[PDB]
Amino acid sequence: TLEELRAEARILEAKAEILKAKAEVLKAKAEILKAQ
Amino acid sequence: TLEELRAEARILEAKAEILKAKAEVLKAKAEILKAQ
Amino acid sequence: TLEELRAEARILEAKAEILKAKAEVLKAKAEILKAQ
Amino acid sequence: TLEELRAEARILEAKAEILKAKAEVLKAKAEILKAQ
Amino acid sequence: TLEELRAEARILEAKAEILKAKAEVLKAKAEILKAQ
Amino acid sequence: TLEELRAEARILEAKAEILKAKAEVLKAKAEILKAQ
Amino acid sequence: TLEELRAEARILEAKAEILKAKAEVLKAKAEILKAQ
Amino acid sequence: TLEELRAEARILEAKAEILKAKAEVLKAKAEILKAQ
Amino acid sequence: TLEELRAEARILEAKAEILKAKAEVLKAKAEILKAQ
Amino acid sequence: TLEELRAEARILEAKAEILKAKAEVLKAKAEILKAQ
Amino acid sequence: TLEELRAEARILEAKAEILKAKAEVLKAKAEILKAQ
Amino acid sequence: TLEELRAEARILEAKAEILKAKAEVLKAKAEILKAQ
Amino acid sequence: TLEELRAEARILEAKAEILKAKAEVLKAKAEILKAQ
Amino acid sequence: TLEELRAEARILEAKAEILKAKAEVLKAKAEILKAQ
Amino acid sequence: TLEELRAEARILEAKAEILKAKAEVLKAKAEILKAQ
Amino acid sequence: TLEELRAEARILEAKAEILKAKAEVLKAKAEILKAQ
Amino acid sequence: TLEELRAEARILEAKAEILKAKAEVLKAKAEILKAQ
Amino acid sequence: TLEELRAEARILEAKAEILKAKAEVLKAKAEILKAQ
Amino acid sequence: TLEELRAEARILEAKAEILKAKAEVLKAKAEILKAQ
Amino acid sequence: TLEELRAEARILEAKAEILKAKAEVLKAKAEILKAQ
Amino acid sequence: TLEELRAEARILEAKAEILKAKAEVLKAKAEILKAQ
Amino acid sequence: TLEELRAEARILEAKAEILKAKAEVLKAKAEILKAQ
Amino acid sequence: TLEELRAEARILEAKAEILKAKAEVLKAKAEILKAQ
Amino acid sequence: TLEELRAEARILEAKAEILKAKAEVLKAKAEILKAQ
Amino acid sequence: TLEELRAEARILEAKAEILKAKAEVLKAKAEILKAQ
Amino acid sequence: TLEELRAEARILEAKAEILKAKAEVLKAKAEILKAQ
Amino acid sequence: TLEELRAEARILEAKAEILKAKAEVLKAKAEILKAQ
Amino acid sequence: TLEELRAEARILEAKAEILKAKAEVLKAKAEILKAQ
Amino acid sequence: TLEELRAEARILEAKAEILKAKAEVLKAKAEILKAQ
Amino acid sequence: TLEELRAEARILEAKAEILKAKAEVLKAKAEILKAQ
Amino acid sequence: TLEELRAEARILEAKAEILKAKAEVLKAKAEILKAQ
Amino acid sequence: TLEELRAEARILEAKAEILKAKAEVLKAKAEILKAQ
Amino acid sequence: TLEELRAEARILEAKAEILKAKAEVLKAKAEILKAQ
Amino acid sequence: TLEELRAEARILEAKAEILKAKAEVLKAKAEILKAQ
Amino acid sequence: TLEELRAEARILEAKAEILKAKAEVLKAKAEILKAQ
Amino acid sequence: TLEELRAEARILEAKAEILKAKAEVLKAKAEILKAQ
Amino acid sequence: TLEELRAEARILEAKAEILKAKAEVLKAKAEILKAQ
Amino acid sequence: TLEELRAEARILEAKAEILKAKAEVLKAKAEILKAQ
Amino acid sequence: TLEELRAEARILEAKAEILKAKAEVLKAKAEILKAQ
Amino acid sequence: TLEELRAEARILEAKAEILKAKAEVLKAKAEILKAQ
Amino acid sequence: TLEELRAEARILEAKAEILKAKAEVLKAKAEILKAQ
């Protein structure tokens, strides 16, 4: 269970990181919208 | 129990971080809505 | 009991943080509702 | 008793913080209700 | 007795803070009831 | 006696503050009863 | 005696303040009884 | 004697204030008895 | 003597004020006795 | 003598005021005796 | 002499006022004797 | 399951990195739009 | 599946790197636009 | 499929490198534009 | 009986006050009849 | 009966206040009739 | 019935307040008629 | 009915406030008429 | 009906606020008329 | 209708704010007229 | 209509802000007139 | 119209900012006038 | 028009920044006038 | 016109930066005047 | 004109940088004046 | 003119760098003055 | 003139570098003064 | 003059390098002073 | 004529008030003549 | 004429107020003459 | 003439206020003469 | 003349304020003379 | 003369403020004399 | 004279501030005298 | 004289600040005396 | 004298800072006395 | 004297810093006393 | 004396730094006490 | 003495660094206690 | 003694470094505990 | 002793390095645990 919960931590750690780079697409998306 | 509660802390630590990047999707979502 | 109460502190520390990021979902939720 | 009362302080310190983030859920809950 | 009364102060300091956040639950509770 | 009376002041200072936040629970309790 | 009477003033100063917040519990107690 | 009488003034100044808040407990005590 | 009589004035000024708040305890004491 | 008589006026001014609040204790004393 | 007689007026002005509040002690003294 | 979840972590780790360099295309895209 | 998912990781690792050097073309593209 | 995906990795690895040296043409292109 | 007679006083106290404001309707009723 | 008579006092207290503001409509009604 | 009569008090309390501000419209209405 | 009458109180509370600011328009209306 | 009356409260709350700032235009309007 | 009335609240909320800053133009307008 | 009224809110939000900085020009305008 | 009103918001957002820095010229203008 | 208004935003964004550094010349101008 | 206005932005961006470093000469100019 | 204005930007970019290092001479000039 | 202004940029770029290393002589000059 | 100014740049480039190594003599000069 | 200034650059390039190795004598001089 | 007669009332209202404060100068004029 | 007579009222309103404070100088003038 | 008479009102408004604070100097002047 | 009389108002406004704080020196001057 | 009278206002504005803080020295001077 | 009077203002501005912090020494001086 | 008076301002500015931190020693001095 | 008074400012600037950190020793000194 | 007073400043600057880190020992000393 | 006082500064500079890292031992000491 | 005090500085400099790495053992010690 | 104290520095320098790498064993020890 | 302490330094220098490579075994140990 211990390493399993360590693994269940490990999969949920990854799911945040996709949403992090999802925001950074939207971050420079506005940077196009202001540099013009 | 001790390392188990340490693990039950560890899984609940991860569940916050998905909601953190969930907000940051919505953060730059408005930044598109103002840079236009 | 001491480290146990330290652990019972430690689990209750985590339960606040989910509610913190729960509010920040609702924080930028209104920010969509004003940037439009 | 001293560190025990220090620990009994420490558990009661945590119980306030859940109620703090409980209010902040309700804080941005009205912020949805005004940004619309 | 001195540090003991300092500790008996310290436990009674914590008991106020739960009631403080207890009110702030009720504070934003009415804020839902007016933002609608 | 001096620091002892200073400590006996210090414990009695705390006992007021619980009653202060006890009233503020009842303060916003009526605020629910009028915002509806 | 001087600082002692200053301290005997200081303890009796605290005893009023508990009764002050004791009244303010009863103050908003009637405010529930009229907001309904 | 001068600062002593100033101190004997200072202790007797405090004894009035407990009776002041003693009346204000009784003040809002009737306010419960009329708001019902 | 001058500042001494000024101080003997100052202590006798305080002794009236305890009797003032002594009456105001009795003032709202009858106010309980009529609001019922 | 002038400021001295001004001071002898000043101490005798205070002695009236204790008797003033002495009457007002007796004033509301009858007010208890009629509100019942 | 002029300001002196003004001061001798000023001390004799105070001596009336003690007798004024002396009567008002006796004024409410009968008011106890009739409210019963 | 453990190495499998380690592998399911490993594929989801890669999917973030494409979106990271996707933003950096848009990052220097605005840098053309300001250096002119 | 394991080495297959390792391979499906391996192809998706390459697709990021083309976009990385795609940005660096645009990086020095603005550097021409400022060195003049 | 495995060595095929290894080969499909291998062709896509090459396509990045042309764009890498494409940028380095533009890198020293500005270096002419500043050394003059 | 005592608090009951205090209550029977309390209801009869209210019945006067309706007649008081009943007269004050008629008071300004003539004030219309003279300001014209 | 006691709190009931307290409530029957409480409803009859309200009925006076409508008649109070009823007069004050008529109060400024004549004030229009004299300021012209 | 008790809280109901408390509520029937509470609705009749509101009906006075509209008439209060109704008079204050007429109050400053004459104040226009005299400041000219 | 209770919360309904609480709501019927709540709508009638609002209708006074428009008339309050209606008077304050007329309040400063005369203040123009006197500052000239 | 409840949230509807809460909404009918909510629209009537807004209509007062325009009249509030309508008065404050007239408030500083006289302040021009006196600072000259 | 509910979100529509929430929107009809939302447009009427904005119309007050223009009048607020309209007054503050007139506020510092007199401040020029007194600093000279 | 909803996002349209959200947009009609959004344009009227901007019109206040020009008047805000219009006042702050006049704010420091008097600050020149007093620092001399 | 939507992005157009978003653009009409966007131009009116800029017009405030010139007036903001217009005030800050006048802000340090008085700071010269006091540092001397 | 859209990118044109985006450009008309972009030129007006620059005009604020000259005035920003114009103030900061005046900011340290007083800092010379106080460090002496 | 678009890239031209982008260029007219680009020249006006540079003119601020000379004034920025102009202030920072004056910034450390006072720092000599206080370190002595 | 475009690359010319880009060049006229480019010469004015250089003139700021001499003044930047001009300040940093004065920056460490005071640092000698405080390390002694 | 273009490459000439590029050259006039290029000579003025060099003149800053002598002043940069001029400061760094003074930078370690104080470092002798503090390491002793 | 062009290559001449390129040469006049080239001689002034060298004069900075002597001062750079002049500082680095003083840099390790303090390093003797602290390693002892 | 051109190759002459190139030569006058070339002699001044050498004079820095003696001072560079002059510092490196002092560099390892402290390294003796710390390895002991 | 109506507002004119209202204005002719308004000027004649002011002429009384100067004579009112004219008497109050003479009122305290005798109060000097008796306090001496 | 109307606003002119309103202004001729307005100047004559001010002339009374100087005489009002003229009397109050004489009011406390006798209060010095009796407190001595 | 109108704003001139408004200004002639404005200067005569100021002349009263000096005499107002002139009396208040004399007001507390006697308060020194009685507190002694 | 208008702004001149506005300025002659402005200097005479200041002369009152020195006398205001002149009285408040004398105000707390007696407060020393009674607190002793 | 105008800015001169503005300056003669400005010096006389400062002379009041020294007397203001002169009183506040005497204000807390009595506060020492009563807290003992 | 103008900047001189500005300077004579500037020195007299400083003399108040020493007296301000002079009072605040005496402010917390009594705070020692009551916290004991 | 001008920079001299600026310097005489500058030395007198420093003398206040020692007294400011002198009070703050006494500020937390009582905070020890109450936390016990 | 000028740099000397600048130096006499500079030594008196340092003497405040020791007293600042002297208070902060006493600041956390009470923080030990409350965290127990 | 100048560099000497600069040195006497420099030694007194160091004496504050020991007391600064003396407080920070006591700062985290309480942090042990609350984390338990 | 100068370099000697510079050295006496230099030894006292070191004595603070041991106490700095002494606190940081205690800093992470509590961090063990909360991470469990 | 000078180099001796420089050496006595040098030994005391080393004693801090052992305590620095002593804390960093305890720093990652808690990092084990949270990563589990 | 000098080189001896330099040597006693040199041995104590080594004892820190073992504890540094002792922590870094524990540093990556937790990194195993999170990468799983 | 000197070379002996140099040797006792030299053996203790080696004991750190085994622990350094001991950590680096554990460093890449987790790198296996993440590359899968």
Author numbering:
A (entry chain U), B (entry chain O), C (entry chain I), D (entry chain C), E (entry chain D), F (entry chain J), ...: 1 to 36
Original authors' sentences:
Here we report seven high-resolution cryo-EM structures of filamentous peptide nanotubes based on a cross-α supramolecular architecture that provide insight into the designability of helical peptide filaments. A structural interaction is identified based on an appropriately placed pair of arginine residues (RxxxR) within the corresponding peptide sequences. This local interaction motif, designated as an arginine clasp, is robust within the context of these cross-α assemblies and can guide the coalescence of helical protofilaments into structurally defined cross-α nanotubes. In contrast to most structurally characterized filaments based on synthetic α-helical coiled-coils, the chain axes of the helical protomers are oriented in a plane nearly perpendicular to the long axis of the assembly.
In a control experiment, a second computational optimization was performed in which positions 6, 7, 10, and 36 were constrained to those in the original peptide sequence. The arginine residues at positions 6 and 10 defined the RxxxR motif, while residues at positions 7 and 36 (Ala and Gln, respectively) appeared to be important for organizing this motif. A comparison between the two sequences, 36-31-3_LL and 36-31-3_RR, could provide additional insight into importance of structural preservation of the arginine clasp interaction. The computationally designed peptides, 36-31-3_LL and 36-31-3_RR, displayed an α-helical conformation and formed high aspect-ratio filaments of similar width to those of 36-31-3. Accordingly, repeating the statistical analysis of this assembly’s RxxxR motif produced very similar results as for the original 36-31-3 filament, indicating the native rarity of the geometry.
